[PDB]
């Protein structure tokens, strides 16, 4: 394939850091070696994330464009929006976001902490809630020129090509390192992000070693997003194979009970893995991922001695937002 | 000078990056080059910052003692603490930490997020105490050390800010000679540093290293205490004490401890009008987040000074951003509409 | 029956007002004439509400048996606990509340708005479960020297919990006097049971007990039916209803509770917000907004007879308002 | 003078009642009665208080006026906001109101709970920065607004209602057989004290009315107050004038800043819950009841006087000091 051909926008540090997760292996037997690769510490941006992969690729046609707004949307806490709010800013772009409760969540600071509260200071305009169009108009309308940035990135004609490339980096990385990884977990929601995935590993054989962990709690649907952009991206990038459902992997067990709630293991998930490696997960997104790959090693599912790297995503500023539900630890 | 004889263990990612602030540099007339040095982004240990960088000097000796426990202290929404939580979870070692509210504050939720949620969440024991009970004056810090031996355990004993202790500032000496190292990848050398003070040994540090190299007086630090003549003190004893143990063949002059007072009020944890506009100008042009109580204060101080036009036409600035972005969580009312 | 052989400690102001919602009453048709008796304004002790009425009866024991401690327990938006803790300061006694998380909510001030900001500024010793706590807590008392008088949830599940509200019906008999006619009904919100079982056995003495309408704000129907039915029974042998209450005495509507105790529903909020507009009269998402939600739906499905008068009991709860501010940001 | 002349559209249960606080007068020492008029308890009307009361005697010039909106004003936690709304509501008319950042505070939650969180669910038009602005919003919407200005207050019609007050007063000391020596009430915008001077200047005890600042702006709340109290004698006939001496107002207990409490309000707010089982806030009571503890524990009170606290209401303030009482 030749992921190559689209020009990248630099909006991160670098390639993101693998760490092994010695503890939290070591907790849970031994048996499996868990590691992570850093995709919440690849930006000066607002503390970047998986989305600030995936806009790299974005940004060179927004430019090429001549917008001069971002325009796109999330739910509340969306991560997606603070994200886009650091771009625009750096970019020297305006920025609508539209956001929208896609949670049954009401919190007292839900809408003033974390995510939210960093596009507003980031000189973002936030619409809280058609919602989407009315948006991409109005920006028109007063005589700007607005980048169309929809969900997660995920259903845009580039936004699969960030994690074509982040397996592109995991190779290299697994040279420098002397080895492979059998097994990557990840997170998936709106989709792109396991997609990229898919396709990057499809390359060398290993697309259905992607083990994708639904936070979505609409396992059909996301299973079928994630399906068809990996499709799009494949046929984008020119991979010598059209990717099929085999080629998709995505657990449904750990998603519960809906998105954006956490369920009492996504918290003892977010707890283990924090107090084992100081490492932070969400309720939403990755602490769900994180439920997902200390359950498989519990139950025996990797096969002894196998080399899990666990993709973090992000998120951790959500954290706020769930202020009461962890208000003693 | 030699830091190199003192073991540093690794809780870093490495050599943090150095970025230009071209957008900022230009809204303010485009006469000082600035960067920042993101100290902000050296860890995966829950968003380190800068006193990450000092730990890494001090977690050698509490591993040769074979303590098990790491024991600190500071205000509500201290970033020290956040940082020991998560570096006594990485190490395997237990954490209890002495909390009261430092500030004339009272946020809704200022318990409850940002750092003390992080705190809570790496498994440190918090200990936060109501007001009006003063843990400085009853010396809780000091029972908290007792309580760990008491119950079997061996505390290691981080005090506020990781400062007033005898590898303190030895983190940030290793800061000037990183920056030098940076200087020569890139071929040119930055004329000033601008970073935040309250503890100290994060500006005595950068004394110490940058003295050696005749930049001391480089270094300009922004009180962030409000209460600049025990700070300024603080900085040049603790760079004093470093200097000695880093075997810096100088002197600490008074002359190379410079803290700016002008950006400090109203008190220490409360931001003014010029520390929200400074935290929104960098936000909205470089993508770059400060808080109200640090990092806000020294860009602010940064902004100002470039601004009356105290930095020579033509200076590299170089920002060191030291963190504390968690913390504009507890501040959520001042931002509500950005 | 005889009410009076039972003291009763002042702890309201008097009688409650009722009070004529027309602007509602009209916005619904107009067939159904709408009014709303005061509990929620009762008394001068923390706002109190229906369980102040409750403890008039209760605290008389109490300082007979020479307590010097109130314990109680409820919720962490409980309504009983803060009036416990008022009356407990005005008696000049010591309180002690055992909170627990009761209601599957998660709001960042939860657990310092509202009623519990009030039981802790009053003075009380509120205990919060973690995240046995009430044998530990009368006993925490008893080793400290004091003697605690314990209050169960609601007030409900105790020999006197159900005077206050016989005594209910006893008022509305004295102002329905002066008003020349009788309420067709009574509408009351119902969870641990004795304001519904007292009003029952109360109206029971003039053949209404079936006309007290309660709506169910527990979400566990069955329970809270049968604990209403059998502290009404209790009551009524207590005072000396001249008859026996009868499993049809006792109405529980069970269609405005959802989806859970503690959490309201669409409907739920539609009602607090149209009472609020079209009478000034607040309620609250956890219990009375519950009742006004069945009153107004009752009346908008013709289930009341045309040109009947309906008392809906506003027991109070308006505080909790303060647990649930997101939902209301916008109104 | 004569009140009667002006209509009054009931708001209110009807009079306010007068509690003893023997608790808290025993604990300062016992030689000191004290006292409290509810005001607080005055209404359904979500809460009401002494806004509430003064509210009755403006409501009939706006029905008169055929006005079909009430627009208010005041800081993001304003009770008089609150009881605007509440009794727009009622009375089926249409509200705006105009909510300014009136106190150097920040928290969370303080323009969503408490006052302001019922004003939205009253369904009264909520707009957080103006007057002019509100007003002549609400005429080119085509209704007609009647205009009521912070606190009611400087209004021809504002003082009014407690000089009904005395009134009410003075015929339940005559069903008790004894006579209050002082009455102690918080004063800020100033009409709530202005009706009071002139109700008690009737009878000779202007100067009984112990007022006690809680804007920390003393001068021009005298001055407010002494002004009010001058239109408001002239409007009811008192045949004698509003001299300085009739204007009590005690500064030392308003500190540090409008809207913010010091420790001796909280102290004050405490004592009296745990005493007495009343709550009162740290804007408004919790300062006046600061101010009547203090005077009495330095004897400032004659051994054996009678002291009536005014409590004007407040309380759902709290709520947006939550941080302040998380342990009592
Ligand atoms: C958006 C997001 C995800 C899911 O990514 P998709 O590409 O939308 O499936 C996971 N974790 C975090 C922190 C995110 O922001
Ligand atoms: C501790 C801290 C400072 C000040 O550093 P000192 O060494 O204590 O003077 C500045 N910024 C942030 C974000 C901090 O946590
Ligand atoms: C307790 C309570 C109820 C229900 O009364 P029960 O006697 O427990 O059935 C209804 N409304 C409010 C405001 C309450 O506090
Ligand atoms: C408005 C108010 C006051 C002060 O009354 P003024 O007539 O404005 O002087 C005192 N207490 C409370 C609770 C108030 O709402």
Redesign the interface.
Known sequence: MNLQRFPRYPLT?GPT?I?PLA?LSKHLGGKVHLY?K?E??NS????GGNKTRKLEYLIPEALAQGCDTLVSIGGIQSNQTRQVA?????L?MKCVLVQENWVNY?????????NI??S????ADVRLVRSWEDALESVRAAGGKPYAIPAGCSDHPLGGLGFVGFAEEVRAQEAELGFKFDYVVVCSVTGSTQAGMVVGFAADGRADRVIGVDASAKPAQTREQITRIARQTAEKVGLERDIMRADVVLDERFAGPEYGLPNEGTLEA??LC???????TDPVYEGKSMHGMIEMVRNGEFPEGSRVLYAHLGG?PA??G????????
Do not use: K, W
């Open positions: 540090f850091p760490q503890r992570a850093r919440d510490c000066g941006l607002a503390f650091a771009v625009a800013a750096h020297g009401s919190d007292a600071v839900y809408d003033r902490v974390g509260q960093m507003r200071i980031l000189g977010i707890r924090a107090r084992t490696e100081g490492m932070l951790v954290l706020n769930y202020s009461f539900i962890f208000r003693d630890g």
